[PDB]
């Protein structure tokens, strides 16, 4: 959209309603007259607009009111409340802005943030921005977490986040105005090469792609119009559903063939009875003819019974002959009807091998976008984030995605090589126990008013526990953690010395021989200016390729590449790198997915903060001490950098409301 409504759309907000959050902070306004709601709403959208139109500088309340017009700039307390809500929840003055009003002289409260992933960095920046003592503990020797950018010389390649999934309503938009990111569109055209090295014929590419999409729609229909979500006391997965849909297609094909060939026997048997009829009739005609000849034999003059005999036999023969001729007409019609049915036979099969294999490559593409075997996805809920997808073409970052975490980390107290071992949270504060990763004998103890936990769901999932909670997380949280899905996906960076591929093609596929190996090195990317190809491993194949040496793997790569480009045109990679994300102990996988048996409701559980019981008994309820952010915690934007970012902004807001108080709610 465009205008202030543009701002609201870009702020992932409904420009014409107050949200649940807004209701919460302004219950006076939403339970009031629609007029003031419209005022409110304009004030909101306009302030949003102002921030958005220039996000490289802090948007002060004074500046905001300065550019507000009457009647809207009459109620200055409404304006202030609004602006404050916006600043707090990170709808404005978030990311990297030049601060007008330099930071608060003395800080209030203490927050310890586990992990300097993108969500970590975000919250930290906001909390600091709000005048709080924030320190982050990071197990790695770098920022970014699952934003991981390879560099050597001029070779630059992400093994982590790679894509901005569209700028329409994306916070990364604001970021890219604040940071120098070389954003580059992705040309979504992708040729497929059969295991041999021959491109799949456009005809095929299309019949298959289309059939894929129809199968998906099919499953959705089974899901939502048919409540096929639960099968045998066990939840159905997208993958199962798919296989059932397919089996029915093959069933239907055999059914068609059976109906057709039965029409052929029905008709063939008609012909049989007609033919019988005609033979017996011919025999009668032979006999009768003989008789008529024998009657004309008798020479005149003959009496009248004799004459009657000839006449009558003649009448009879002409009769039977007529009848035979009609039958023969009928025989003609049946024979040509049989040539028609023998001419229009239904389709021989549902899918050939080349067919099911190309189809397998489309399935592998799916397994890749979800980082998991389709057998694990919830039939009913795997697609549930789809309603909030951004608008506009997906994009890559040419200078690497690392620049963003780095950018965020400026001004922040970050402790690297600090692996948190245990978290202790009590009615009166918290202590985090960590170690030096280099020398895990050295110990650190950090005391704070609250902990922000942005540990990856893979880490949180670990058994036995990499991080210990004292007291333990409540059953409702741990069960949510078990229920979710933390998936896996890997990359192979190939650095050559000269481009030997089609430079107008950003990306191209390779089709796997088996269903099982459908995810092994299925796709390739040239997105970098420099010559660099990226080979993707997903699906069941993801996990398995991690137990194979780097060398063997780059081997299978150059193999595929030679098959497609010829042995004399592919050279040894100057430099090679291979991710192993499930193996990484700080990640323990790539990103969350709606496991079958899970729901997006679990993501919401993940984000619920924990409140320690009282120290003294019969003492009042205490303030929450443990908070959660990261990608696994955001219902509408899971498994994305912008999702991490948003969850960070969220928790920082909540934390600040907690310990600093929310002045904007009266």
């Amino acid at each position: 959209p465009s205008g202030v409504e543009g701002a609201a759309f870009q702020s992932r907000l409904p420009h014409d309603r107050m949200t649940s959050q807004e209701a919460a902070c302004f219950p006076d306004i939403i339970s009031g007259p629609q007029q003031t709601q419209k005022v409110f709403l304009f004030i909101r959208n306009r302030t949003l607009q102002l921030w958005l139109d220039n996000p490289k500088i802090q948007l002060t309340f004074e500046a905001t009111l300065q550019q507000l017009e009457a009647p809207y700039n009459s109620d200055t307390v409404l304006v202030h409340r609004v602006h404050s809500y916006l600043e707090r929840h990170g709808l404005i003055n978030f990311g990297i802005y030049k601060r007008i009003k330099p930071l608060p002289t003395k800080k209030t409260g203490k927050v310890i943030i586990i992990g300097s992933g993108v969500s970590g960095l975000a919250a930290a920046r906001q909390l600091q921005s709000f005048g709080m003592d924030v320190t982050l503990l990071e197990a790695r020797d770098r920022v970014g977490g699952r934003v991981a950018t390879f560099r050597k010389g001029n070779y630059v390649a992400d093994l982590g986040a790679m894509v901005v999934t569209g700028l329409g309503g994306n916070p990364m938009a604001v970021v890219s105005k604040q940071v120098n990111m070389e954003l580059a569109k992705i040309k979504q055209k992708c040729p497929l090469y059969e295991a041999n090295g021959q491109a799949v014929p456009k005809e095929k590419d299309e019949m298959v792609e289309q059939e894929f999409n129809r199968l998906l729609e099919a499953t959705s229909y089974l899901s939502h119009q048919l409540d096929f979500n639960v099968l045998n006391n066990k939840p159905v997965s997208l993958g199962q559903a798919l296989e059932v849909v397919i089996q029915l297609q093959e069933k239907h094909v055999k059914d068609e063939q059976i109906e057709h060939w039965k029409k052929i026997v029905k008709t063939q048997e008609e012909l049989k009875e007609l033919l019988n009829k005609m033979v017996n009739l011919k025999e009668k005609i032979k006999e009768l003819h003989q008789q008529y000849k024998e009657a004309s034999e008798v020479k005149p003059p003959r009496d009248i019974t004799a004459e009657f005999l000839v006449k009558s036999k003649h009448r009879d023969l002409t009769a039977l002959c007529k009848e035979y001729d009609e039958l023969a007409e009928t025989q003609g019609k049946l024979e040509e009807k049989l040539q028609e049915l023998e001419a229009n036979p239904p389709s021989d099969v549902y899918l050939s091998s080349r067919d099911r294999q190309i189809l397998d490559w489309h399935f592998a593409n799916l397994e890749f976008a979800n980082a998991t075997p389709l057998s694990t996805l919830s039939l009913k809920h795997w697609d549930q984030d789809d309603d909030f997808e951004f608008t506009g073409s997906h994009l890559t970052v040419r200078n690497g995605y690392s620049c963003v975490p780095v950018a965020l980390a400026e001004g922040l107290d970050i402790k690297l090589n600090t692996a948190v071992r245990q978290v202790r949270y009590t009615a009166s504060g918290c202590e985090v126990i960590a170690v030096n990763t280099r020398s895990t004998s050295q110990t650190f103890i950090y005391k704070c008013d609250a902990v922000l936990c942005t540990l990856p769901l893979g880490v949180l999932k670990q058994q036995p526990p990499a991080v210990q909670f004292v007291p333990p997380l409540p059953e409702w949280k741990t069960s949510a953690v078990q229920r979710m899905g933390f998936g896996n996906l890997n990359k192979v960076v190939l650095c050559f010395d000269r481009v030997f591929w089609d430079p107008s093609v950003n990306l191209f596929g390779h089709v796997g021989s088996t269903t099982a190996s459908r995810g092994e090195l299925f796709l390739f990317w040239n997105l970098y200016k420099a010559p660099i190809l990226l080979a993707l491993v997903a699906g069941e194949a993801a996990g398995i390729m991690e137990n194979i040496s780097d060398d063997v793997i780059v081997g299978r790569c150059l193999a595929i590449l030679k098959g497609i480009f010829g042995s004399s045109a592919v050279p040894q990679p100057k430099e090679t790198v291979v991710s192993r994300w499930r193996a990484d102990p700080w990640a323990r996988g790539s990103y969350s997915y709606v496991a079958a048996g899970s729901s997006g409701n679990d993501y919401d559980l993940m984000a619920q903060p924990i409140t320690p019981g009282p120290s003294i008994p019969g003492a009042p309820q205490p303030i929450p001490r443990l908070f959660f952010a990261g990608e696994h915690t955001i219902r509408n934007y899971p498994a994305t950098v912008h999702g991490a970012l948003l969850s960070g902004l969220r928790e920082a807001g909540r934390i600040a409301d907690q310990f600093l108080g929310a002045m904007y709610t009266l």
């Binding site: 792609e209 976008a369 789809d386």
Partner: peptide, 10 residues
């Protein structure tokens, strides 16, 4: 006119 969006689960 590409099939799936590009990086969405859709």
């Amino acid at each position: 006119x590409x099939x799936x969006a590009l990086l969405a689960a859709x």
